Design a protein around this ligand. Structure first.
Ligand code: HEC
Ligand code: HEC
Ligand code: ZN
Ligand code: ZN
Lengths: 136, 136
């Protein structure tokens, strides 16, 4: 019933990025530069196939510094993780939701079985609870 | 003596990202959100080895739209490409420097055999002419 830490996610496929700056509704708690990563199984789902069990998506969040009209990546704040298991994570739509503080395997963040996460991702039922779109 | 178009670069290892905002000394031409990618061979150099022939680094530049203090990726503006070949690219320190407008293989940007590119990258001779640092 727990989400596996996604070991080696930094070597996976880079889906997309975004910057969330102060004044953005979501600046607490996902302010910063984020990168979405997808393992091979998650790419099947992102391309418009179905997500196999074992699909993992990672939201990789960095603090940033202002450096002379540049935003420069600072420390990692956290990662968010969605792991596909239709049976084991059926209470949250077939995805397990977990957060790791500073991307550390020992700093698990989710306390409610991922019901809060799922609460928002549920809006994306039609794209199997994934916001991120594959781009060129 | 032309740099090959790095087909498949979007499936490569994501090294790092940076936002260059208007007013940066290099807004013309690299204003936008950029993502650096490395093929397997380029990873060897980023980790502290010698860059082998066939190492390729890509600078993937996107426009962005500031939308309610999110910076949202728009269209690709260009890619920059460094291709390692100690013999063939000897005049520019063993890297071949090319740009592709909108990331299209038909839209070569470099017109001076890469001397201007080399002129700036020479400052990084001690890190084999590479600015980007591999981060976890
Ligand atoms: C709305 C109020 C959200 C809540 C609460 C959570 N997430 Fe979410 N997440 C949200 C958005 C708008 C996005 C897209 C970001 C973008 O750049 O487009 C995401 C994305 C993720 C991802 C990447 C996969 C995807 O769906 O795009 C992961 C892995 C992810 N989120 C995990 C996650 C977890 C673990 C949450 C609870 C701790 C959680 N999210 C909350 C919107 C919202
Ligand atoms: C200084 C005035 C530069 C000139 C002219 C060119 N480049 Fe360069 N480039 C520069 C910096 C500071 C960086 C690092 C960006 C970062 O996020 O840290 C880069 C990066 C690249 C890369 C990625 C590999 C690396 O060295 O980090 C490539 C592939 C690259 N640049 C290509 C490139 C080409 C093709 C150029 C002439 C058209 C060129 N650059 C010019 C600084 C400067
Ligand atoms: Zn200024
Ligand atoms: Zn703003």
């Amino acid at each position: 019933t727990k989400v596996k830490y996604p070991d080696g996610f930094r070597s996976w496929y880079h889906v997309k990025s975004m910057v969330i700056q102060p004044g953005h509704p979501l600046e607490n708690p996902v302010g910063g530069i984020h990168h979405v990563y997808a393992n091979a199984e998650a790419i099947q789902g992102l391309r418009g196939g179905n997500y196999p069990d074992g699909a993992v998506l990672v939201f990789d969040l960095f603090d940033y510094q202002e450096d002379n009209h540049a935003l420069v990546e600072g420390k990692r704040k956290l990662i968010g993780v969605m792991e596909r298991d239709a049976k084991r994570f059926s209470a949250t739509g077939g995805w397990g939701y977990e957060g790791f503080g500073e991307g550390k395997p020992d700093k698990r963040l989710v306390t409610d079985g991922g019901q809060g996460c799922f609460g928002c991702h549920a809006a994306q039922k039609e794209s199997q609870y994934v916001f991120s779109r594959l781009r060129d």
